[PDB]
Amino acid sequence: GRTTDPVRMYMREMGTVELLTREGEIDIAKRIEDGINQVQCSVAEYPEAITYLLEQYDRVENSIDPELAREKFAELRAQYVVTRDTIKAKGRSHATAQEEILKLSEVFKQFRLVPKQFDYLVNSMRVMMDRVRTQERLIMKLCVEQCKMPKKNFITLFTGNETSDTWFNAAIAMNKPWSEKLHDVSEEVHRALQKLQQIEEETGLTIEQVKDINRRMSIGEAKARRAKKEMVEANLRLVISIAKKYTNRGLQFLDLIQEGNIGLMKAVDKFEYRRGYKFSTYATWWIRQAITRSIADQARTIRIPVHMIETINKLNRISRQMLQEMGREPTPEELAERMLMPEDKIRKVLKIAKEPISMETPIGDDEDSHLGDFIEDTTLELPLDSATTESLRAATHDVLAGLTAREAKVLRMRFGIDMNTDYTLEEVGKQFDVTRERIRQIEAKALRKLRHPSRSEVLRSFLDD
Amino acid sequence: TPEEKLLRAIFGEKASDVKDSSLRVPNGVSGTVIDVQVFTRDGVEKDKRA
Amino acid sequence: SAAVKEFFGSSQLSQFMDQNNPLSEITHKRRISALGPGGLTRERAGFEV
Amino acid sequence: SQIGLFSKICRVTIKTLHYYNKIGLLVPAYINPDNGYRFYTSDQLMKFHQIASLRQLGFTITEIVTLTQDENSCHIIERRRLEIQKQIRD
DNA sequence: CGCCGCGTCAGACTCGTAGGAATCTAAACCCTCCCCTTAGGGGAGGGTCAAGGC
DNA sequence: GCCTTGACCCTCCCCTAAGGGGAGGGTTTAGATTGTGTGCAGTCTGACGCGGCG
Ligand code: 118
């Protein structure tokens, strides 16, 4: 396309959308709102396996009268306890049921945007619906291994009848030998189908009404999603016009844009058109919040917490005006007196605001000598020290041979020489069954002999450290 | 080290909390001192020589 | 202040003075250079210049 | 009412309210499940008045607790009247 | 087939010195965890000081 | 000489009542505002290989 720049590639794919007018955003928000309540409608007459609000009003048990908070919850359930008495009559799809449960929907429409409370009721069937799905997958991974059979008669009448296994009698009807080529495995089909039939027991309702109105419940959750998408896609110029005042502060342009878009996606989710204000006035807050939060979390090699960021910024703002006013830079005393903090903290803050230098920094007249060439390894031992360590080990091994073997084993155990660990008196006397005190006696013996001048001046040579 | 621990046990000497970081003349150089200057921070005790 | 002190302290034409002689300084203050910002590069100058 | 406004109704610090909740002396009315915020009501103030009234006589926290929830237990008060009568002498 | 445009790769060795490293705005509220405050108590684990039994 | 007592002693960690001070982390904020910007860098010559168009 004759270009490889991704900022132009973005600003080009972003310009194929039109800006909205004051009525466009209102009637987009209206359908965003009514799809999410069409869903809440569809959740209404699902069986008691849902987490329905019977005692959610009691689970929790603008400051509204307690008598108002206790009473208006009695309207809905006062009609609901008598309404779904008709769950039995004429199957599961009775028309009085649709009429009065969409009258419960007439009641339901009153409400508007809410936290994940509503979410946790539709999840009430998530954990239950896909379950059903996956179980009828199991039957299939138990049929295809043994026999091959055309799927569009079987699964079609599977969708249709759901009364009993009598639809398998529709498999032999065409009189081809693939009818009962299956042998000794159909009880596994009956296994999984029977377990989902006891799932049907706990639900009490057949699958082709639950999935039937889930087909229309999925219409609301998609029709809200699509309107949210085209409410987001029409406002990207706002993000791009805000995020151009945060440049040269540690992030690149497209990073700031992709941080602003995640805030716009929340301003779209929290909007309320009834309050009468435009969309820009509410969205700018979330856009700026996202960009500001990402500048303080990224964009430093060594990360500083947010409270220290605000302290640094405040001290910069004070020193600017004191420099404009005095004509000089103020000493930390003149900053402590006005910032009203203890001077040691003002001295502590002033060290934390420096970014590490690159190891490729050219140092000299040329550019073949770098800063990283003159950096020395500090954790190495000098060879004079290695030789000294080995010579001292040999000298000690020679002096430890003069005195008794049993009387040197105790020194080896007591100072840990040639062993994996140091030991204590009682655990050494464990193997000697000698008293707590005799060990100390023989140690004061050995250490008294070992400094007699017939022996000491070979080891004394080392202690000039 | 264990061996150096036994050395300290025998001859009784102990080290201390501070290390020597003094400024020295580099090798090969031999000169006469002609000037000294001391710069100390505001809020620090000035010393006899300063 | 940043733009001024960066020029006076880290430029390529701002140089540590040569101070062996009187003549060393007189000569350092009269030198003319073709390198620097807006000038040639050592590797990419030809024979004719 | 949130903790910051209730702290100005009673003229007491916030760390004091946190401590009293930890001890079990003054428990808020409602605590947010996910945030953890504390909300108070007027009867909390009627009880804080009693707490301060008891605290003005020199009792420590355990006896104030034992005094508020439990039976009258009059033997603790006069027993305090000796610890003051002695203390003055000292 | 042939010419031209355009993109990629290369350009001697060893020594010296030379201080510091360059713009750049959020504010109110809540929570939990960690250490601090007097003047000593209490224990755990590991050492030391005379005295004899043999 | 080769062991057993009964005293003594030391350092290190955790504890007391009623909060105080701070570090480091979470959340929202409703008049409107709808496409970058540096007062850029662009700056060498020679040989070679491949694609795109006549
Ligand atoms: C410079 C420019 C804007 C703000 Sb603000 C703001 C700050 C304090 C009190 C009220 C408003 C802001 C908002 C969210 C995140 C970061 C900063 C602000 C917001 C919208 C419109 C105009 C200004 C601050 C400094």
Side-chain angles (χ1 to χ4, degrees), chain A residues 232 238-239 256-271 279 282-291:
Chain A
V232 166
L238 189 62
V239 187
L256 301 155
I257 281 154
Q258 293 283 124
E259 286 294 338
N261 287 351
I262 315 192
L264 161 78
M265 289 208 290
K266 203 167 193 190
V268 168
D269 209 351
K270 291 207 193 317
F271 196 60
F279 186 76
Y282 185 54
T284 298
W285 289 97
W286 286 109
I287 282 164
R288 300 187 101 103
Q289 180 264 348
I291 301 182

mmCIF file of all heavy atoms in Angstrom, chain A residues 232 238-239 256-271 279 282-291, chain F residues 29:
data_model
loop_
_atom_site.group_PDB
_atom_site.id
_atom_site.type_symbol
_atom_site.label_atom_id
_atom_site.label_comp_id
_atom_site.label_asym_id
_atom_site.label_seq_id
_atom_site.Cartn_x
_atom_site.Cartn_y
_atom_site.Cartn_z
ATOM 1 N N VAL A 232 -18.581 3.161 20.356
ATOM 2 C CA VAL A 232 -17.144 3.331 20.545
ATOM 3 C C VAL A 232 -16.488 3.819 19.259
ATOM 4 O O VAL A 232 -15.708 4.774 19.268
ATOM 5 C CB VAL A 232 -16.507 2.017 21.029
ATOM 6 C CG1 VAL A 232 -15.013 2.089 20.905
ATOM 7 C CG2 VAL A 232 -16.885 1.740 22.457
ATOM 8 N N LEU A 238 -11.889 11.830 19.398
ATOM 9 C CA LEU A 238 -11.809 12.446 20.717
ATOM 10 C C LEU A 238 -10.579 11.959 21.471
ATOM 11 O O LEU A 238 -9.826 12.760 22.041
ATOM 12 C CB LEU A 238 -13.084 12.134 21.492
ATOM 13 C CG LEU A 238 -13.367 12.806 22.824
ATOM 14 C CD1 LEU A 238 -13.484 14.295 22.651
ATOM 15 C CD2 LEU A 238 -14.635 12.228 23.400
ATOM 16 N N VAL A 239 -10.364 10.642 21.481
ATOM 17 C CA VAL A 239 -9.163 10.066 22.070
ATOM 18 C C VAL A 239 -7.918 10.643 21.422
ATOM 19 O O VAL A 239 -6.952 10.990 22.107
ATOM 20 C CB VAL A 239 -9.189 8.535 21.945
ATOM 21 C CG1 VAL A 239 -8.037 7.945 22.689
ATOM 22 C CG2 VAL A 239 -10.483 7.987 22.460
ATOM 23 N N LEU A 256 -0.067 5.888 23.846
ATOM 24 C CA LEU A 256 -1.049 6.759 24.476
ATOM 25 C C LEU A 256 -2.434 6.573 23.868
ATOM 26 O O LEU A 256 -3.436 6.571 24.589
ATOM 27 C CB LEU A 256 -0.603 8.211 24.355
ATOM 28 C CG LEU A 256 0.747 8.563 24.964
ATOM 29 C CD1 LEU A 256 1.318 9.777 24.292
ATOM 30 C CD2 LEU A 256 0.610 8.812 26.432
ATOM 31 N N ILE A 257 -2.515 6.415 22.548
ATOM 32 C CA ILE A 257 -3.816 6.205 21.914
ATOM 33 C C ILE A 257 -4.445 4.897 22.382
ATOM 34 O O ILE A 257 -5.634 4.846 22.726
ATOM 35 C CB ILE A 257 -3.675 6.252 20.384
ATOM 36 C CG1 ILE A 257 -3.602 7.691 19.905
ATOM 37 C CG2 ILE A 257 -4.818 5.552 19.716
ATOM 38 C CD1 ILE A 257 -2.888 7.833 18.614
ATOM 39 N N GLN A 258 -3.666 3.816 22.407
ATOM 40 C CA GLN A 258 -4.242 2.546 22.820
ATOM 41 C C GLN A 258 -4.506 2.485 24.310
ATOM 42 O O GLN A 258 -5.199 1.573 24.761
ATOM 43 C CB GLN A 258 -3.344 1.386 22.423
ATOM 44 C CG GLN A 258 -3.242 1.175 20.949
ATOM 45 C CD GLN A 258 -4.458 0.508 20.393
ATOM 46 O OE1 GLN A 258 -5.097 1.021 19.487
ATOM 47 N NE2 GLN A 258 -4.801 -0.637 20.945
ATOM 48 N N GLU A 259 -3.951 3.411 25.091
ATOM 49 C CA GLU A 259 -4.355 3.505 26.491
ATOM 50 C C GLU A 259 -5.634 4.315 26.656
ATOM 51 O O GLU A 259 -6.469 3.988 27.500
ATOM 52 C CB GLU A 259 -3.241 4.116 27.330
ATOM 53 C CG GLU A 259 -2.084 3.191 27.587
ATOM 54 C CD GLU A 259 -2.454 2.009 28.443
ATOM 55 O OE1 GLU A 259 -3.453 2.088 29.179
ATOM 56 O OE2 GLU A 259 -1.735 0.996 28.390
ATOM 57 N N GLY A 260 -5.802 5.375 25.865
ATOM 58 C CA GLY A 260 -7.045 6.126 25.895
ATOM 59 C C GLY A 260 -8.254 5.335 25.440
ATOM 60 O O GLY A 260 -9.363 5.552 25.939
ATOM 61 N N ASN A 261 -8.073 4.425 24.481
ATOM 62 C CA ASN A 261 -9.218 3.672 23.973
ATOM 63 C C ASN A 261 -9.823 2.753 25.026
ATOM 64 O O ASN A 261 -11.035 2.512 25.012
ATOM 65 C CB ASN A 261 -8.827 2.863 22.746
ATOM 66 C CG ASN A 261 -8.620 3.719 21.536
ATOM 67 O OD1 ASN A 261 -8.926 4.900 21.544
ATOM 68 N ND2 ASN A 261 -8.097 3.130 20.483
ATOM 69 N N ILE A 262 -9.014 2.258 25.964
ATOM 70 C CA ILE A 262 -9.544 1.401 27.019
ATOM 71 C C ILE A 262 -10.347 2.195 28.041
ATOM 72 O O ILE A 262 -11.191 1.625 28.738
ATOM 73 C CB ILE A 262 -8.401 0.624 27.694
ATOM 74 C CG1 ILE A 262 -7.458 0.057 26.640
ATOM 75 C CG2 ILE A 262 -8.944 -0.503 28.528
ATOM 76 C CD1 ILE A 262 -6.470 -0.941 27.178
ATOM 77 N N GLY A 263 -10.125 3.503 28.139
ATOM 78 C CA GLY A 263 -10.940 4.348 28.982
ATOM 79 C C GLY A 263 -12.222 4.768 28.297
ATOM 80 O O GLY A 263 -13.278 4.873 28.931
ATOM 81 N N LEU A 264 -12.133 5.035 26.994
ATOM 82 C CA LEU A 264 -13.342 5.312 26.229
ATOM 83 C C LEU A 264 -14.293 4.123 26.250
ATOM 84 O O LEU A 264 -15.517 4.296 26.311
ATOM 85 C CB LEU A 264 -12.984 5.691 24.797
ATOM 86 C CG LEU A 264 -14.042 5.612 23.701
ATOM 87 C CD1 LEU A 264 -14.956 6.797 23.766
ATOM 88 C CD2 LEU A 264 -13.362 5.566 22.369
ATOM 89 N N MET A 265 -13.756 2.905 26.218
ATOM 90 C CA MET A 265 -14.621 1.736 26.292
ATOM 91 C C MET A 265 -15.328 1.588 27.630
ATOM 92 O O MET A 265 -16.220 0.746 27.739
ATOM 93 C CB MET A 265 -13.827 0.469 26.019
ATOM 94 C CG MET A 265 -13.395 0.301 24.594
ATOM 95 S SD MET A 265 -13.222 -1.436 24.201
ATOM 96 C CE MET A 265 -11.782 -1.831 25.167
ATOM 97 N N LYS A 266 -14.941 2.348 28.650
ATOM 98 C CA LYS A 266 -15.623 2.367 29.940
ATOM 99 C C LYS A 266 -16.590 3.530 30.063
ATOM 100 O O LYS A 266 -17.678 3.381 30.635
ATOM 101 C CB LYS A 266 -14.601 2.440 31.072
ATOM 102 C CG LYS A 266 -15.114 1.927 32.385
ATOM 103 C CD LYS A 266 -13.995 1.730 33.369
ATOM 104 C CE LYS A 266 -14.472 0.924 34.557
ATOM 105 N NZ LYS A 266 -13.476 0.905 35.661
ATOM 106 N N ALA A 267 -16.200 4.690 29.534
ATOM 107 C CA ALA A 267 -17.131 5.806 29.432
ATOM 108 C C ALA A 267 -18.363 5.426 28.630
ATOM 109 O O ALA A 267 -19.463 5.894 28.931
ATOM 110 C CB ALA A 267 -16.452 7.015 28.801
ATOM 111 N N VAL A 268 -18.208 4.581 27.611
ATOM 112 C CA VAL A 268 -19.379 4.126 26.866
ATOM 113 C C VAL A 268 -20.232 3.197 27.722
ATOM 114 O O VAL A 268 -21.458 3.153 27.579
ATOM 115 C CB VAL A 268 -18.935 3.461 25.551
ATOM 116 C CG1 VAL A 268 -20.069 2.739 24.892
ATOM 117 C CG2 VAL A 268 -18.390 4.491 24.615
ATOM 118 N N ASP A 269 -19.620 2.481 28.655
ATOM 119 C CA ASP A 269 -20.369 1.534 29.465
ATOM 120 C C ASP A 269 -21.054 2.182 30.660
ATOM 121 O O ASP A 269 -21.952 1.571 31.245
ATOM 122 C CB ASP A 269 -19.439 0.427 29.952
ATOM 123 C CG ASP A 269 -20.157 -0.877 30.170
ATOM 124 O OD1 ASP A 269 -21.398 -0.887 30.112
ATOM 125 O OD2 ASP A 269 -19.479 -1.899 30.393
ATOM 126 N N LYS A 270 -20.654 3.392 31.045
ATOM 127 C CA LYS A 270 -21.238 4.040 32.214
ATOM 128 C C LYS A 270 -22.148 5.213 31.874
ATOM 129 O O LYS A 270 -22.647 5.873 32.786
ATOM 130 C CB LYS A 270 -20.136 4.504 33.160
ATOM 131 C CG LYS A 270 -19.408 3.375 33.835
ATOM 132 C CD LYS A 270 -18.837 3.826 35.155
ATOM 133 C CE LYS A 270 -17.846 2.822 35.679
ATOM 134 N NZ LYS A 270 -18.355 1.442 35.504
ATOM 135 N N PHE A 271 -22.384 5.485 30.596
ATOM 136 C CA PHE A 271 -23.151 6.658 30.198
ATOM 137 C C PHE A 271 -24.616 6.521 30.583
ATOM 138 O O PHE A 271 -25.161 5.420 30.672
ATOM 139 C CB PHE A 271 -23.044 6.869 28.695
ATOM 140 C CG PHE A 271 -23.468 8.226 28.239
ATOM 141 C CD1 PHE A 271 -22.829 9.355 28.696
ATOM 142 C CD2 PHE A 271 -24.491 8.371 27.327
ATOM 143 C CE1 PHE A 271 -23.209 10.602 28.263
ATOM 144 C CE2 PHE A 271 -24.872 9.615 26.894
ATOM 145 C CZ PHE A 271 -24.230 10.730 27.363
ATOM 146 N N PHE A 279 -22.030 13.584 25.432
ATOM 147 C CA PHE A 279 -21.154 12.448 25.692
ATOM 148 C C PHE A 279 -19.721 12.884 25.953
ATOM 149 O O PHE A 279 -19.017 12.254 26.747
ATOM 150 C CB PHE A 279 -21.201 11.479 24.520
ATOM 151 C CG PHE A 279 -20.454 10.210 24.758
ATOM 152 C CD1 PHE A 279 -20.981 9.230 25.564
ATOM 153 C CD2 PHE A 279 -19.231 9.993 24.163
ATOM 154 C CE1 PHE A 279 -20.302 8.069 25.776
ATOM 155 C CE2 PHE A 279 -18.552 8.831 24.375
ATOM 156 C CZ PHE A 279 -19.088 7.870 25.179
ATOM 157 N N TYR A 282 -18.802 13.682 29.699
ATOM 158 C CA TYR A 282 -18.578 12.557 30.589
ATOM 159 C C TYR A 282 -17.409 11.687 30.168
ATOM 160 O O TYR A 282 -16.772 11.075 31.026
ATOM 161 C CB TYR A 282 -19.825 11.689 30.670
ATOM 162 C CG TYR A 282 -19.701 10.571 31.657
ATOM 163 C CD1 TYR A 282 -19.353 10.823 32.969
ATOM 164 C CD2 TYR A 282 -19.932 9.265 31.283
ATOM 165 C CE1 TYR A 282 -19.247 9.809 33.878
ATOM 166 C CE2 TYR A 282 -19.831 8.247 32.185
ATOM 167 C CZ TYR A 282 -19.486 8.523 33.480
ATOM 168 O OH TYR A 282 -19.380 7.502 34.383
ATOM 169 N N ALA A 283 -17.100 11.611 28.874
ATOM 170 C CA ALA A 283 -16.072 10.678 28.434
ATOM 171 C C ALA A 283 -14.664 11.203 28.662
ATOM 172 O O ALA A 283 -13.736 10.401 28.854
ATOM 173 C CB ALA A 283 -16.265 10.343 26.960
ATOM 174 N N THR A 284 -14.483 12.524 28.630
ATOM 175 C CA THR A 284 -13.141 13.073 28.780
ATOM 176 C C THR A 284 -12.501 12.670 30.105
ATOM 177 O O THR A 284 -11.285 12.446 30.162
ATOM 178 C CB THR A 284 -13.197 14.586 28.642
ATOM 179 O OG1 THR A 284 -13.666 14.913 27.334
ATOM 180 C CG2 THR A 284 -11.840 15.192 28.822
ATOM 181 N N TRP A 285 -13.303 12.521 31.162
ATOM 182 C CA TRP A 285 -12.771 12.145 32.468
ATOM 183 C C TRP A 285 -12.104 10.778 32.420
ATOM 184 O O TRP A 285 -10.961 10.618 32.859
ATOM 185 C CB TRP A 285 -13.886 12.160 33.514
ATOM 186 C CG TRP A 285 -14.356 13.540 33.870
ATOM 187 C CD1 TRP A 285 -15.438 14.182 33.368
ATOM 188 C CD2 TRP A 285 -13.744 14.449 34.792
ATOM 189 N NE1 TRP A 285 -15.544 15.432 33.914
ATOM 190 C CE2 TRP A 285 -14.514 15.619 34.793
ATOM 191 C CE3 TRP A 285 -12.619 14.386 35.615
ATOM 192 C CZ2 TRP A 285 -14.200 16.709 35.582
ATOM 193 C CZ3 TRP A 285 -12.312 15.469 36.394
ATOM 194 C CH2 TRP A 285 -13.097 16.615 36.375
ATOM 195 N N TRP A 286 -12.790 9.787 31.855
ATOM 196 C CA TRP A 286 -12.236 8.442 31.812
ATOM 197 C C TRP A 286 -11.057 8.347 30.854
ATOM 198 O O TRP A 286 -10.097 7.613 31.116
ATOM 199 C CB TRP A 286 -13.314 7.451 31.417
ATOM 200 C CG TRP A 286 -14.289 7.175 32.481
ATOM 201 C CD1 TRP A 286 -15.581 7.573 32.522
ATOM 202 C CD2 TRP A 286 -14.067 6.412 33.664
ATOM 203 N NE1 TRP A 286 -16.183 7.116 33.659
ATOM 204 C CE2 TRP A 286 -15.272 6.398 34.380
ATOM 205 C CE3 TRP A 286 -12.963 5.744 34.192
ATOM 206 C CZ2 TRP A 286 -15.407 5.743 35.592
ATOM 207 C CZ3 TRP A 286 -13.097 5.096 35.396
ATOM 208 C CH2 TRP A 286 -14.309 5.100 36.084
ATOM 209 N N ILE A 287 -11.101 9.082 29.743
ATOM 210 C CA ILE A 287 -9.968 9.049 28.820
ATOM 211 C C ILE A 287 -8.707 9.565 29.507
ATOM 212 O O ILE A 287 -7.655 8.903 29.499
ATOM 213 C CB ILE A 287 -10.289 9.844 27.543
ATOM 214 C CG1 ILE A 287 -11.189 9.027 26.627
ATOM 215 C CG2 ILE A 287 -9.034 10.205 26.808
ATOM 216 C CD1 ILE A 287 -11.847 9.836 25.569
ATOM 217 N N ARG A 288 -8.799 10.744 30.130
ATOM 218 C CA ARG A 288 -7.633 11.297 30.808
ATOM 219 C C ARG A 288 -7.179 10.407 31.949
ATOM 220 O O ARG A 288 -5.977 10.291 32.207
ATOM 221 C CB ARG A 288 -7.927 12.690 31.332
ATOM 222 C CG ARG A 288 -8.314 13.668 30.290
ATOM 223 C CD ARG A 288 -8.413 15.042 30.886
ATOM 224 N NE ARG A 288 -7.231 15.832 30.589
ATOM 225 C CZ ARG A 288 -7.189 16.778 29.661
ATOM 226 N NH1 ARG A 288 -8.267 17.050 28.947
ATOM 227 N NH2 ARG A 288 -6.070 17.451 29.449
ATOM 228 N N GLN A 289 -8.118 9.767 32.645
ATOM 229 C CA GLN A 289 -7.732 8.898 33.747
ATOM 230 C C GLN A 289 -6.900 7.727 33.255
ATOM 231 O O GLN A 289 -5.882 7.384 33.862
ATOM 232 C CB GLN A 289 -8.966 8.401 34.488
ATOM 233 C CG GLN A 289 -8.652 7.500 35.646
ATOM 234 C CD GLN A 289 -8.737 6.045 35.286
ATOM 235 O OE1 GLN A 289 -9.236 5.690 34.229
ATOM 236 N NE2 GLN A 289 -8.236 5.190 36.158
ATOM 237 N N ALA A 290 -7.308 7.101 32.150
ATOM 238 C CA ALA A 290 -6.546 5.958 31.651
ATOM 239 C C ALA A 290 -5.149 6.366 31.202
ATOM 240 O O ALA A 290 -4.161 5.691 31.524
ATOM 241 C CB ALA A 290 -7.293 5.278 30.511
ATOM 242 N N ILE A 291 -5.039 7.482 30.479
ATOM 243 C CA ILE A 291 -3.715 7.881 30.004
ATOM 244 C C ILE A 291 -2.806 8.249 31.171
ATOM 245 O O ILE A 291 -1.629 7.859 31.209
ATOM 246 C CB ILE A 291 -3.827 9.030 28.992
ATOM 247 C CG1 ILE A 291 -4.676 8.605 27.805
ATOM 248 C CG2 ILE A 291 -2.472 9.426 28.510
ATOM 249 C CD1 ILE A 291 -4.797 9.651 26.761
ATOM 250 P P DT F 29 -18.549 8.956 38.897
ATOM 251 O OP1 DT F 29 -19.896 9.189 39.435
ATOM 252 O OP2 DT F 29 -18.396 8.330 37.576
ATOM 253 O "O5'" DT F 29 -17.769 10.347 38.877
ATOM 254 C "C5'" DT F 29 -17.795 11.178 40.014
ATOM 255 C "C4'" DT F 29 -16.972 12.436 39.799
ATOM 256 O "O4'" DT F 29 -15.565 12.107 39.798
ATOM 257 C "C3'" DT F 29 -17.242 13.180 38.494
ATOM 258 O "O3'" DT F 29 -17.416 14.566 38.755
ATOM 259 C "C2'" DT F 29 -15.977 12.929 37.679
ATOM 260 C "C1'" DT F 29 -14.931 12.808 38.767
ATOM 261 N N1 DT F 29 -13.731 12.043 38.350
ATOM 262 C C2 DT F 29 -12.490 12.589 38.528
ATOM 263 O O2 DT F 29 -12.310 13.681 39.017
ATOM 264 N N3 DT F 29 -11.460 11.807 38.103
ATOM 265 C C4 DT F 29 -11.548 10.559 37.531
ATOM 266 O O4 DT F 29 -10.564 9.933 37.183
ATOM 267 C C5 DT F 29 -12.873 10.045 37.372
ATOM 268 C C7 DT F 29 -13.083 8.696 36.762
ATOM 269 C C6 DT F 29 -13.890 10.802 37.783
#
